Amino acid sequence: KLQAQKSDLESQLMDTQERLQQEEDNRNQMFQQKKKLEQEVGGLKKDI
Amino acid sequence: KLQAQKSDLESQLMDTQERLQQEEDNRNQMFQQKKKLEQEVGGLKKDI
Numbered sequence A, B: 001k002l003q004a005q006k007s008d009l010e011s012q013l014m015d016t017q018e019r020l021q022q023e024e025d026n027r028n029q030m031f032q033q034k035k036k037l038e039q040e041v042g043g044l045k046k047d048i
Helices: A011-020 A023-035 A038-047 B002-047
Strands: none
Touching: A011 A023, A011 B002, A023 A038, A023 B002, A038 B002
């Protein structure tokens, strides 16, 4: 049973590390969408 | 050798858990960074 409490781990660890590989897009989808922003509003404040 | 190897897996039960909460809460200020600036995107482009 001590290995039974071991074996049910790495099941959800594959879920959470994929979930950890899930959030890196929302990490990265912001970073492009801010580099599309502060580069254009810095261009836009230059236009004003 | 079980419990020394086991405790490293429960560290990843905590590390992959909290680093998931590291991102989406960092996403919250990231999503706050967008819509409160995108309102200022329209108003300055309204001025042009």
